[PDB]
Design a protein around this ligand. Structure first.
Ligand SMILES: NC(=[NH2+])NCCC[C@H](N)C(=O)O
Length: 235
């Protein structure tokens, strides 16, 4: 039909808006390229990240492309395409900060996470319970803003989003990663994928076919090179 694809546009370089409100980023490029090969029209629909799976279940959108990690919990509720790219999580803080992604370091500190994210799940279970002030936000822009305002000591999000979308931008010049990637298979998933209703077998097959084809002919790498000088796909 027309495939309606939901995304949250506060996660550069994967999904954001340009100065005239056009959606831009690697998620947008992947979605548009897949749609072309599937020979379908696609309409992008912006929403808060935590609204994406509910909107999909409610049939207000037909697909999610929004750095949506493929997790065990989410697969109980929806289906996923094959992996679009890998996504590790990592903390950021002010440059020179001693902060580490540990309870010892973070107890009593204010740590921002995106509401509805794997980072929120991780932080709520491991940090909020034990006395870290975990603050959950409607979108990632509010997090970066509250961090630069000094209201947050740190923020947890996807590593590549933080790096390319903030640290390497003027806004994040005085900030840096605090500690290494936070690796936990119980939480952050096995890369990201197109989120789909479980019964939409045909639509999943179509996305999967287009994805294989655009990876195979080198289009994936061509598009990825616009944003990344490393292997974003992973293994
Ligand atoms: N467009 C976005 N805001 N994406 C947030 C993704 C965060 C994390 N990868 C998750 O799946 O929960």
């Amino acid at each position: 039909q027309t495939v309606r694809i939901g995304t949250d546009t506060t996660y550069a370089p994967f999904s954001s808006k340009d100065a005239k409100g056009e959606f831009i980023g690697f998620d947008i490029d992947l979605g548009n390229e897949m749609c072309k090969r599937m020979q379908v029209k696609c309409t992008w629909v912006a929403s808060d990240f935590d609204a994406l799976i509910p909107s999909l279940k409610a049939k207000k959108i037909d697909a999610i492309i929004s750095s949506l990690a493929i997790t065990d919990k989410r697969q109980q509720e929806i289906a996923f395409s094959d992996k679009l790219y890998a996504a590790d999580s990592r903390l950021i803080a002010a440059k020179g900060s001693p902060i580490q992604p540990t309870l010892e370091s973070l107890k009593g500190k204010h740590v921002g996470v995106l509401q509805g994210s794997t980072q929120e799940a991780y932080a709520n279970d491991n940090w909020r319970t034990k006395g870290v002030d975990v603050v959950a936000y409607a979108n990632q822009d509010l997090i970066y803003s509250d961090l630069t305002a000094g209201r947050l000591d740190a923020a947890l999000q996807d590593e590549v989003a933080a790096s390319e979308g903030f640290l390497k931008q003027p806004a994040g010049k005085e900030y840096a990663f605090a500690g290494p990637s936070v690796k936990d298979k119980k939480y952050f998933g096995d890369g990201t994928g197109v989120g789909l209703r479980k019964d939409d077998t045909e639509l999943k097959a179509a996305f999967d076919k287009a994805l294989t084809e655009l990876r195979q002919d080198g289009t994936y790498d061509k598009m990825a090179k616009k944003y990344f000088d490393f292997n974003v796909y992973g293994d």
